[PDB]
């Protein structure tokens, strides 16, 4: 029984959002006592996702967006599949079901989406429309459709409270967290990539929205805390994006043990080299560049962008920096949550 009610954004909230994301067709609504920002179309499948039947062989990769999900998905898939790199050449989007991907699309507004493009005429309509149709399918139906004899790999940015309670009694999950400031910068660019932001909007406007819990799937800390509280569970592996950059081999090992898979030092070094930023970046199976031919990606933006930690310093001025510290200190008060890089 779905125990959550949703509410429209009040004038003040709606004002800050409609000033940065207004041009984009899909709208938001606050969900649950924590007021998680979810695209309106989410509500048609929220209860189903809360009650989604789960299987013991299911493996989830969850995170607040732009925290290292893609890397993790690749590592997790190769490790669960005997490091069959050849097979890993298929599109990541075909190897994983994006549970909450559908929500960004509202069929009722199909005509309004191509208008966010500089040249709506240069679209590969056949693929564009095929994209809209798949996205019209609730996430739960996608999972349910996968045959039992096929291991299900699920990607999601949904906080644990919107998914089946005790889901961890059945499935394994790897949750990624990353310094909120770099997440904001990466989320800013990602919004630019898909034409989600008003062109006349800048990063500071994006930051105001993001740290105030007015961007997609925030409040950021409530999302992280829910997973952090469950890190003790044997079926949960909480990792930090920063650690991937400090010692990927060590991280690869942690993920292998968690998945009950043993790897030789050679196998690990091979996985590490496979995730080298430049190689990974030009890896068409994961860089989503297959969508550029369609016309829905903005020039000068990429799914796999920089790959560094600490670049937020190039985007936050003195004030923003101070504002961010207060926000982080307040949310880390009375909790053992700590970020490796901070
Ligand atoms: N092999 C890799 N090594 C390091 N960072 C990587 C990577 N592949 C992707 N990333 C980074 O991970 C972030 C994407 O997160 P997610 O997959 O959850 O959406 C991006 O951050 P940046 O925008 O800072 O570059 C992206 O460039
Ligand atoms: C279907 C569709 C769109 C494309 C969405 C895409 C390509 C989403 C993939 C997102 C990822 C991979 C990031 C989260 O992890 C856009 C927004 C153009 C507008 C309308 C309908
Ligand atoms: Ca139109
Ligand atoms: Hg590590
Ligand atoms: Hg390496
Ligand atoms: Hg930098």
**How many angstroms separate the CA atoms of 161 and 168, rounded?**
12
Residue located nearest, by CA, to atom 10 of ligand 1: 307
Going from the Cα of 247 to the center of ligand 4, the distance in angstroms, rounded, reads 4
Contacts of 197 (CB under 8 A, 6+ apart): 20, 21, 23, 24, 188, 191, 206
Task: Report whether 82 belongs to an annotated binding site.
Answer: no
**How many angstroms separate the CA atoms of 165 and 101, rounded?**
21
Residues, CB within 5 angstroms of ligand 3 (ion): 111, 114-115
Could you tell me how far CA 60 lies from the centroid of its own chain? 12
**How many angstroms separate the CA atoms of 129 and 135, rounded?**
10
Task: Report whether 289 belongs to an annotated binding site.
Answer: no
Q: Quick count: other Cβ atoms within 10 Å of Cβ 202? A: 12
CA 87 vs CA 25, 71, 81, 96: distances in Å: 37, 16, 9, 13
- Whether ligand 1 lies within 6 angstroms of the CB of 65 is answered as yes
- Whether ligand 2 lies within 6 angstroms of the CB of 135 is answered as yes
DSSP state string for 142-167: HHHHS-TTS--EEEE---GGGS-TTG
Nearest to 160 by CA among 39, 54, 28, 21: 54
Using DSSP, state whether 121 is helix, strand or coil. Answer: helix
Enclosing H/E stretch for 177: strand 172-177
Q: Which atom of ligand 1 is found nearest the CA of 189?
A: 23
Q: Of the CATH numbers 3.90.950.10, 3.40.50.10490, 3.40.190.10, 3.40.50.300, which one belongs to the domain with range 1-342?
A: 3.40.50.300
**How many angstroms separate the CA atoms of 103 and 286, rounded?**
21
Q: Would you say 176 and 67 are in contact if contact means Cβ atoms under 8 Å apart?
A: yes
CA 115 vs CA 46, 192, 290, 337: distances in Å: 28, 15, 21, 43
Q: Would you say 187 and 66 are in contact if contact means Cβ atoms under 8 Å apart?
A: yes
Could you tell me how far CA 107 lies from the centroid of its own chain? 22
Query: Tokens standing for 297?
Result: 């990606």
Contacts of 157 (CB under 8 A, 6+ apart): 62, 63, 64, 65, 69, 100, 216, 217
Query: Tokens standing for 27?
Result: 């709208």
**How many angstroms separate the CA atoms of 195 and 117, rounded?**
7
Residue located nearest, by CA, to atom 16 of ligand 1: 66
Task: Report whether 115 belongs to an annotated binding site.
Answer: yes
Using alpha carbons only, how large is the chain's radius of gyration in Å? 19
Going from the Cα of 317 to the center of ligand 6, the distance in angstroms, rounded, reads 14
In terms of Cβ atoms closer than 10 Å to its own Cβ (0-12, 13-18, 19+), residue 121 is exposed
Nearest to 153 by CA among 59, 83, 87: 59
Give exposure, 209-238, as e/b (b: 16+ Cβ within 10 Å): bbbbbbbbbbbbbbbbbbbbebeeeebbbb
Long-range contacts of 157-160 (CB under 8 A, 24+ apart): 157/62, 157/63, 157/64, 157/65, 157/69, 157/100, 157/216, 157/217, 158/49, 158/62, 158/99, 158/100, 158/217, 159/34, 159/36, 159/217, 159/222, 159/223, 159/226, 159/227, 160/62, 160/226, 160/227, 160/230
Which residues sit opposite 317 in a β-bridge? none
Best probe residue, ligand 1, of 66, 76, 92, 313 (max atoms within 8 Å of C-beta): 66
Nearest to 251 by CA among 234, 231, 227, 275: 275
Nearest to 224 by CA among 325, 135, 338, 318: 338
Q: Would you say 254 and 66 are in contact if contact means Cβ atoms under 8 Å apart?
A: no
**How many angstroms separate the CA atoms of 101 and 273, rounded?**
29
Residue with tokens 């950021």: 220
What does the domain layout of the chain look like in residue ranges?
Answer: 1-342
Q: Which atom of ligand 1 is found nearest the CA of 308?
A: 24
Q: Mutual orientation of helices 180-193 and 220-228 as an angle, nearest 10°?
A: 120
**How many angstroms separate the CA atoms of 157 and 61, rounded?**
9
Best probe residue, ligand 1, of 63, 65, 68, 276 (max atoms within 8 Å of C-beta): 68
Strands 97-98 and 153-156, how do they pair? parallel
In terms of Cβ atoms closer than 10 Å to its own Cβ (0-12, 13-18, 19+), residue 11 is exposed
Query: Tokens standing for 237?
Result: 């592996």
Query: Tokens standing for 323?
Result: 């504002």
Long-range contacts of 329-337 (CB under 8 A, 24+ apart): 331/221, 335/225, 335/228, 337/224, 337/225, 337/228
Contacts of 21 (CB under 8 A, 6+ apart): 191, 196, 197, 198, 209
Q: Which atom of ligand 1 is found nearest the CA of 73?
A: 17
Is the CA virtual torsion 193, 195, 199, 203 positive or negative? negative
Query: Tokens standing for 47?
Result: 């209860």
Q: Would you say 155 and 64 are in contact if contact means Cβ atoms under 8 Å apart?
A: no
Nearest to 259 by CA among 57, 20, 46, 10: 57
CA angle 152, 154, 158 (to 5 degrees): 150
CA 339 vs CA 92, 229, 233, 285, 320: distances in Å: 28, 15, 20, 30, 19
């Amino acid at each position: 029984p779905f125990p959550y009610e949703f509410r429209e954004l009040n004038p003040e909230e709606d004002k800050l959002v409609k000033a940065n994301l207004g041009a984009f067709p899909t709208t938001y609504v606050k969900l649950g006592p924590k007021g998680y920002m979810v695209y309106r179309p989410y509500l048609k499948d929220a209860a189903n996702i809360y009650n989604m039947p789960l299987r013991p062989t299911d493996v989830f990769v969850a995170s607040y967006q732009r925290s290292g999900t893609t890397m993790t998905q690749e590592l997790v898939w190769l490790i669960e599949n005997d490091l069959n790199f050849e097979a890993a050449k298929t599109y990541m989007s075909l190897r994983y079901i994006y549970l909450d991907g559908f929500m960004i699309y509202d069929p009722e507004k199909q005509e309004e989406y191509n208008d966010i493009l500089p040249n709506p005429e240069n679209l590969d309509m056949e693929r564009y429309l095929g994209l809209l149709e798949y996205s019209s399918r609730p996430g739960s139906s996608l999972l349910a459709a996968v045959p039992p004899t096929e291991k299900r790999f699920v990607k999601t940015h949904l906080p644990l409270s919107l998914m089946p309670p005790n889901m961890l009694d059945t499935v394994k999950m790897v949750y990624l967290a990353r310094d909120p400031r770099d997440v904001a910068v990466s989320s800013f660019h990602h919004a630019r990539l898909l034409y989600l932001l008003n062109k006349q909007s800048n990063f500071k406007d994006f930051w105001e929205m993001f740290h105030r819990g007015l961007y997609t799937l925030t409040p950021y800390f409530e999302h992280v805390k829910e997973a952090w509280a469950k890190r003790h569970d044997p079926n949960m592996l909480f990792l930090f994006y920063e650690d991937y950059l400090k010692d990927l081999p060590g991280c690869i090992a942690r993920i292998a043990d968690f998945l009950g898979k043993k790897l030789s030092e050679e196998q690990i070094q091979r996985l590490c080299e496979h995730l080298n930023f430049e190689k990974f970046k030009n890896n068409g199976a994961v860089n989503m560049e297959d969508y550029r031919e369609i016309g829905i990606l903005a020039d000068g933006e990429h799914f796999i962008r920089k790959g560094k930690a600490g670049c937020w310093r190039d985007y936050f001025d003195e004030e923003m920096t101070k504002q961010a510290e207060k926000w982080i200190k307040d949310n880390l008060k009375d909790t053992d949550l700590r970020y490796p890089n901070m």
